[PDB]
Amino acid sequence: MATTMEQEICAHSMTFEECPKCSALQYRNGFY
């Protein structure tokens, strides 16, 4: 695998760069 796919795959449901969005979804999803 080598941690590589490219298609929004975070420990939440997004991409590395979008990892900070997993919580910051401006919703009840997360806050920080």
* Site for Zn ion, rule CB under 5 A: 10, 12, 19, 22
Least spacing, CB of residue 2 vs Zn ion, in Å: 19
Assigned token pair, 14? 């997004």
Nearer to Zn ion, 10 or 25 (CB): 10
Nearer to Zn ion, 1 or 17 (CB): 17
Report CA-CA distances (Å) from 6 to 3, 12, 16.
Answer: 9, 15, 10
Does residue 22 have a known ligand-binding role? yes
Rounded Cα distance, 32 and 4, in Å: 26
Binding-site residues for RNA, please? 22
